[PDB]
């Protein structure tokens, strides 16, 4: 770096020595000037990256702020799922009327849309109907008998 | 930043230095200044972003107000699914296991009237030590 | 390093030695010096790295300040997922097993409305000594 | 500084929820929502269980797993 | 000197965690995160268990393995 930073010093010293080097053999150098300069990168690469990142810090500080406040976006997002929970919650604490009904409107719309699906479904004791006389059938039917439910 | 928050100084320095420079080479630089000028990217662009997102702040401030009114839909696709619960819960609680039961099998119909559109349904019992093996 | 932290000595030594050398062969070397010069790689390049990474030091010093403000995002993608917990926890603690329960099966819908986009879901019971075998 | 973020978030998730499984279940279940919304981008072969898709319909397993509503059968 | 490094690290992991499985589970689970993030570079054929992908949904196994939230069913 000290070459880039002090390239004036470098070129001045080069001319200062080279004019006297040439003047020995009767050669008056009016000008001696550095035309180019090179390195690999690394010194200057890190030296640039330092100020790169120093202000990347700022680049993301106001984003910290932006986000502190894009989070009350989400605050308001999910009071929606919380007061809905209020009025689903104080609402249903008696018996499984609609929770079953909704299991079952599930069974409706769920497998209405299983159409758009390709579900391979596999099933159970008494779904499609046909334990027809096995005592499992009739005891799972005598829920209607108040006591066999 | 200092190069052009004070560019007049930078350009004037380069200009008078170059004028005195060309003077020695018998050259009267009657004027000189900085034709072109730039920097890197992000010391350049992030003090920019500093006030960019002081307004991104308002953008999000106001997308908040959009979500406020979006999520009513999530409330309201379910509002009525819930009142129906209000009704039928105390309905067939006092009433009993009537349509608790019988819609199961108005289901059976509406179920497989549509399961026809499906093509690989299958079936087994219980009450045994029932034990499944299934096809491809 | 010593070859060119003192190169004037090296070049002058080679030059006067070669001048007296050519003198014996009837040759007046009116001047001599080192045209070309190099070394290996890493005694060469590591004293270089010594001050390279005294500035890599600042590079990392300042990438630290970038991470400081990156990880707010990790904080804040979860901040609200947590306040919702604040709310509903003391909600259905006092309230009970209402929507503890019923969103399970607003789930069932939103679950498999989408499981349709999946194509190999399957199912079995419990309460038995249920025992699985599965397809390809 | 990375993971004080995951620790104070843990503070305010932690002192927050020690009563009953309201939203922990709700979030199991918004899981069931968004999880298998994105199982779309997946190709999951899912295989399932006692009472998920609905249909123990009258087996006593069904109705006892429904009578959680009966305060005492839960 | 190689493995005083793995021993004093063990000091300050050791006197550190003797209360309850907060981060040991969390790290099982950031495992579940980064492990199978890198299972991408893998070709793992994984095969799984009772309640991982979500779907004992109503089987009592589901709900008793959920009522850990009920302080006493954990």
Numbering used by the authors:
A (entry chain U): 151 to 299
B (entry chain T), C (entry chain V): 137 to 272
D (entry chain W), E (entry chain A): 226 to 299
Sentences reproduced from the published study:
Prohibitin-1 and -2 (PHB1 and PHB2) are members of the Stomatin/prohibitin/flotillin/HflKC (SPFH) protein family. Among other proposed functions, the prohibitin complex supports cristae architecture and negatively regulates the activity of the matrix-resident AAA protease (m-AAA), which cleaves numerous matrix and IM proteins. Three-dimensional (3D) subclassification of the subtomogram averages revealed two distinct conformational states of the prohibitin complex present in untreated and OA-treated cells, both of which resolved to approximately 20 Å.
We termed these two conformational states “open” and “closed” on the basis of detectable protein density for the dimeric membrane-anchoring domains of the prohibitin complex. Finally, the top of the dome is assembled by tight packing of the C-terminal helix C-α2, leaving a central pore that is formed from the disordered C-terminus that forms a beta strand complementation with adjacent subunits. Prohibitin 2 contains an additional C-α3 that sticks up above the dome cap. This fully assembled closed prohibitin dome is approximately 20 nm in diameter and rises 10 nm above the membrane. We refer henceforward to the fully assembled state as the closed conformation. An additional unmodeled density occupying 180 nm3 was present on the matrix side of the membrane which cannot be accounted for by prohibitin itself. There is insufficient unmodeled mass in prohibitin 1 and 2 to account for this density, which therefore most likely reflects ordered portions of prohibitin-associated proteins or alterations to bilayer organization. Quantification of the two populations of complexes revealed a statistically significant shift from 75 open to 56% open after depolarization, indicating that the prohibitin complex is basally in a dynamic assembly of states and that depolarization drives the complex toward closure. Under depolarization, prohibitin shifts to the closed “inactive” state, which could, in principle, reduce the degradative capacity of m-AAA with respect to integral membrane proteins of cristae.
